[PDB]
Write a structure and sequence with these properties.
The complex is a hetero-oligomer of 18 chains, with nine copies of chain A and nine copies of chain B. By secondary structure, chain A is mainly α. Chain A has one helix and no strands. In chain A, about 15% of the residues are buried. Classes of the chains: A mainly alpha, B mainly alpha. The structure holds bacteriochlorophyll A (BCL) (3 copies), spheroidene (7OT) (9 copies), lauryl dimethylamine-N-oxide (LDA) (3 copies) and calcium ion (9 copies). Chains B, C, E, G, I, K, L, N, O: Keywords: Antenna complex, Bacteriochlorophyll, Cell inner membrane, Cell membrane, Chlorophyll, Chromophore, Light-harvesting polypeptide, Magnesium, Membrane, Metal-binding, Transmembrane, Transmembrane helix.
Chain lengths: ~45, ~50, ~50, ~45, ~50, ~45, ~50, ~45, ~50, ~45, ~50, ~50, ~45, ~50, ~50, ~45, ~45, ~45
């Protein structure tokens, strides 16, 4: 567990970093999904 | 979700700026593509001037 | 507001210049897009010479 | 709390940095919001 | 599948960002090519404004 | 087998890295294959 | 005025050249935009030759 | 307060640097404001 | 086949990414050239919309 | 023969690296040769 | 004249080449702008030929 | 043949990638020039299509 | 006063560097001012 | 002639290549400008062909 | 011939690649200029085709 | 003759490197010469 | 005077470097002056 | 004379390097001079 890999992180630190990246991606995606529905409603795209 | 070990072999100070920069560039590319290929988006900027 | 741990794994001397530079570039891109696609912003610069 | 992460910061320092970034973003956003209302009022955009 | 020893002599913090960046760029290049060479993809963006 | 190569990895670590790259490629390829069938069905490409 | 702690985490030998370079580039961009979009600034350079 | 931060500066040094940046910005802005009044008076911009 | 000593004096972490990147770029250049100079490849993308 | 050259490799390691590069090139070339025959058959190139 | 402390926090190995390079680039930009936007400077190069 | 001492003062890990990269770029430039200036090479790509 | 700052200079060395930059700028500006008068006299600019 | 102390605070291995490179680039820029803005220089290359 | 002390203060691993690269680029620039401004050089590539 | 120069090579190593570069150049040139004869025969260049 | 400055040179070495730069500039300028007279004589520039 | 300068060379090594550069330049120039005579003879340049 305590092994420090060539990035300088441990396994647990690397998972902690990625979990925040996953969370941020979900926030971005949720906003983007709303923006696409707005774009579909308000622009000529999709009619 | 399963790829978290990427940060054992990629430095986050490299990969996280690259990841976010790529997202930002991608968004600009998409907006620029829509602007350059539709009439309706430049008409939106033009507003009541046309 | 919750992302403050980003500065544990990204160097601020990398990410803060990048963040502000990206904001500056984005603003220029938006202003340039409006200038190139509208008539009203070029007319503003042209002023009474038209 | 003492742990120095690979950026060279502690948790507390990293939060202190980000809080100033949050504050600066709010200032920029407040100014940008005012600029958009001025743009809507003075330019042909939105009529 | 057989090339796993590449990471004995290439640093993953170089090669993994490069690999993924190349994939991302390749995808953009293909999408941009279709957008610039077809009528049907810009017509899709143009939507009902045509 | 404990030899550390000039990348900083051992043989076993290098195979572990590449196996995740292989897995990720298969996921990307599966999604791309679906996207090509959708493109063929919904766009004028291939008729 | 309140942001002086930026120089605790950004190296001034990075950020100060970047800051001043960005200002210089911004000024050139603005002058270039006026030159390319107005007739009056080109006519100023052209002088009595018109 | 003698702490040397990752930039290599102390708090007091960092404030001393920024104060000179603030001063220089005010000089640039004062000159730019004069140049804008000259531009407004001498060019067709704003009439 | 006889040039394997190149990796005594070139770092593989430089030369292997460069070698593969050059191959990738070369392929893109060839595909782009065919796309830009033929009618038949853009017609293939255009499909039934022509 | 255990001499370490300026790349960080021994002679034996450098040959091991290059042999994999040779193998990969042969795979790429085999696929490219097939792709050229497909291109010749399916496209107007060469008639 | 009062800014001499800039060289306490910017390396002259960086800032002095940048400063002089920016001046050189700026001069080229101005000369190129005059060349491209006037007739009289191209005519000066053209001389007696037309 | 007589210049072999160049590798006493140039790093091969610099100069050998540069040398081969320059050769590769040069070849692309020559092929691109022929493609862009002849009719016969784009006709070769166009094949039976026109 | 003998403190060495993060550039590697002392205060006195930094002032000595900047004085030479100030001097050089004055020379450049003097030449540029002459060149502008020549440009005004010999070119159509300003008539 | 009086600026020789520049090499106390600029590394010559930076500044001397930059200085000579800038001179070389400047010369190319001037030659290219004359070539692109005169009839007489391209006519010199064209020779007896036209 | 008298400038050999340049290699006391410029690293040859910098300056020799730069020197040769500049020569190579210069040659390409000259050949490209002739190709783009004469008819006789593209006619030479075109050969019996036209 | 065992002196190590600033590249990290000895005289003998530097000659060994260059001799492989010379050999590779001759191979490339031989192939290029054949390609030029093919180009002259098969293309309109030189008639 | 034997002080080594941040470039790695002494005052005397820095002056020796610059003197060779001055000499080289004079040679370049002399050649350039001749080239301008040739250009004025042989080209339509200046008549 | 055995002093090692900031490039890592001695005076004698730096002269040895430059002499090979001078020789190479003369070879390039001799070839270029021949190529210019060929260009003058075979192309429309100079008639
Ligand atoms: C109208 C729709 C467009 C179009 C739109 C798009 C878009 C948009 C995209 C693609 C993408 C791809 N397209 Mg498509 N595409 C079109 C038509 C084609 C045609 C064709 C002849 O008509 C081909 C060959 C392809 C092929 C491809 C793939 C190369 C690529 C996805 C690869 C992947 O997932 O690998 C995954 C791989 C695997 C799962 C397994 C691989 C196993 C084998 C054995 C490996 C062999 C390796 C080889 C020997 C060596 C490789 C060397 C390296 C290149 C260095 N498309 C049409 C014209 N296509 C995507 C892409 O490139 O993404 C980056 C993409 O984004
Ligand atoms: C229709 C076909 C095209 C065409 C298509 C192509 C294509 C496509 C390519 C070439 C390539 C080459 N072409 Mg051809 N080529 C055409 C017509 C020409 C003409 C001409 C006047 O008509 C010339 C001079 C050339 C010449 C050349 C070579 C310079 C080059 C291969 C060099 C090599 O293998 O060296 C090997 C060298 C040796 C074996 C020995 C050298 C020994 C000598 C003594 C060394 C002297 C060195 C000198 C003094 C100093 C050099 C300094 C360095 C440049 C820094 N071609 C026609 C118009 N040609 C290839 C290329 O550039 O690849 C990178 C290439 O890919
Ligand atoms: C038809 C022919 C073309 C033309 C073709 C070319 C070509 C081609 C070239 C030049 C080159 C040059 N041309 Mg001419 N040139 C033309 C007409 C002009 C006109 C003009 C108003 O008509 C001017 C001012 C110039 C001037 C110049 C020089 C700036 C330059 C050579 C400088 C040199 O050797 O310095 C040597 C300097 C000295 C010996 C002494 C200097 C001493 C002084 C006191 C130093 C003062 C420094 C100052 C205060 C600060 C400088 C700051 C730095 C810029 C950072 N040409 C015509 C239109 N010219 C060459 C060039 O730029 O090469 C790089 C070049 O290759
Ligand atoms: C027609 O073709 C055109 C022209 C349109 C071109 C084609 C373009 C295409 C194909 C575009 C495709 C775009 C795509 C695929 C976009 C994808 C976007 C995604 C997935 C965005 C994700 C965003 C995620 C974000 C913003 C995440 C932020 C995370 C943050 C801020 C957390 C930061 C902190 C850490 C990573 C670690 C903290 C440390 C700890 C110890 C916890
Ligand atoms: C049609 O398409 C077009 C052409 C328009 C292209 C599309 C463009 C698009 C899509 C543009 C989108 C733009 C966006 C998303 C812009 C976002 C802007 C934001 C969020 C700006 C934020 C700015 C924040 C600032 C300026 C913050 C400054 C902070 C400062 C100065 C504090 C500095 C100090 C520290 C960080 C730490 C100090 C240290 C301590 C220890 C306290
Ligand atoms: C007509 O010409 C045009 C214009 C179209 C130009 C031509 C374009 C062409 C020819 C394009 C060709 C494109 C190709 C060949 C695309 C290939 C795409 C592929 C193969 C994509 C693969 C993607 C793979 C991914 C996304 C893998 C992700 C893996 C992840 C996230 C795992 C990360 C973790 C690790 C590597 C190690 C973790 C550590 C451990 C210790 C386990
Ligand atoms: C229509 O769209 C177009 C095309 C026009 C594009 C749009 C362009 C836009 C949107 C442009 C916007 C431009 C802006 C926002 C420009 C802002 C300019 C500013 C704020 C300039 C500030 C300049 C400040 C200067 C020059 C400060 C100099 C400071 C100096 C010299 C002091 C140096 C010393 C130190 C920092 C520390 C010394 C050390 C000590 C220990 C004391
Ligand atoms: C008309 O002109 C146009 C416009 C067309 C421009 C002209 C373009 C031209 C002239 C293009 C020419 C293209 C050429 C010459 C392409 C050549 C392609 C080749 C030779 C490709 C080779 C590919 C090889 C690959 C993909 C090899 C992969 C190897 C791998 C993955 C193994 C990796 C592992 C290691 C190297 C070492 C592992 C470590 C160990 C200890 C065993
Ligand atoms: C219409 O828009 C267009 C297209 C025209 C674009 C717009 C362009 C614009 C807006 C251009 C603006 C240009 C400006 C603002 C130019 C400014 C030029 C300046 C201020 C030039 C200054 C030059 C100074 C020089 C050459 C100084 C040289 C100093 C030397 C050689 C001394 C070197 C030594 C040291 C620094 C230290 C020595 C060490 C010691 C220990 C003493
Ligand atoms: C009209 O103008 C246009 C547009 C055409 C532009 C003009 C273009 C022009 C002027 C192009 C000119 C092109 C030229 C001059 C091309 C020259 C090509 C040459 C000389 C190519 C040489 C290639 C050599 C190769 C591929 C050598 C490979 C060597 C290898 C693989 C060996 C690698 C190993 C080592 C170096 C050392 C191993 C270590 C040991 C200890 C033994
Ligand atoms: C219309 O606008 C256009 C388009 C034309 C653009 C405008 C362009 C403009 C404005 C161009 C202006 C060009 C200028 C200002 C050019 C200036 C040229 C100069 C000053 C050239 C100087 C050349 C000097 C040389 C070649 C010196 C070489 C020195 C050497 C080789 C000595 C090397 C050794 C050492 C430095 C140190 C040795 C070590 C020792 C210990 C002794
Ligand atoms: C109309 O305007 C256009 C468009 C044409 C643009 C204008 C272009 C212009 C103005 C172009 C001007 C071009 C010029 C000035 C070209 C100059 C070319 C020269 C001088 C070339 C010299 C070449 C020299 C070579 C190839 C030397 C090679 C030396 C070698 C291989 C030896 C390598 C070894 C060592 C340096 C050291 C070995 C170590 C030891 C210990 C002995
Ligand atoms: C990477 C960005 C790619 C943008 C590609 C689109 C550029 C404009 C294409 C031509 C204009 C299409 N049109 C006429 C419908 O506007
Ligand atoms: C755009 C002009 C750029 C000029 C070069 C700027 C400095 C490059 C980096 C070398 C100097 C810094 N350092 C620390 C290595 O001495
Ligand atoms: C535009 C030509 C560029 C030539 C390549 C750049 C010069 C070589 C730089 C070498 C840097 C690595 N180094 C100093 C350890 O050798
Ligand atoms: Ca809609
Ligand atoms: Ca409005
Ligand atoms: Ca279809
Ligand atoms: Ca006005
Ligand atoms: Ca066929
Ligand atoms: Ca005048
Ligand atoms: Ca023929
Ligand atoms: Ca004349
Ligand atoms: Ca002739």
């Amino acid at each position: 567990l305590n092994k420090v890999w060539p990035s300088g992180l441990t396994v647990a630190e690397a998972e902690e970093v990625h979990k925040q990246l996953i969370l941020g991606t979900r926030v971005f995606g949720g906003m983007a999904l709303i923006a696409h529905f707005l774009a579909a409603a308000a622009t000529p795209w999709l009619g | 979700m399963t790829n978290g070990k990427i940060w054992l072999v990629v430095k986050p100070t490299v990969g996280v700026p690259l990841f976010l920069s790529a997202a930002v560039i991608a968004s600009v590319v998409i907006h620029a593509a829509v602007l350059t290929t539709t009439t309706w988006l430049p008409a939106y900027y033009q507003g009541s001037a046309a």
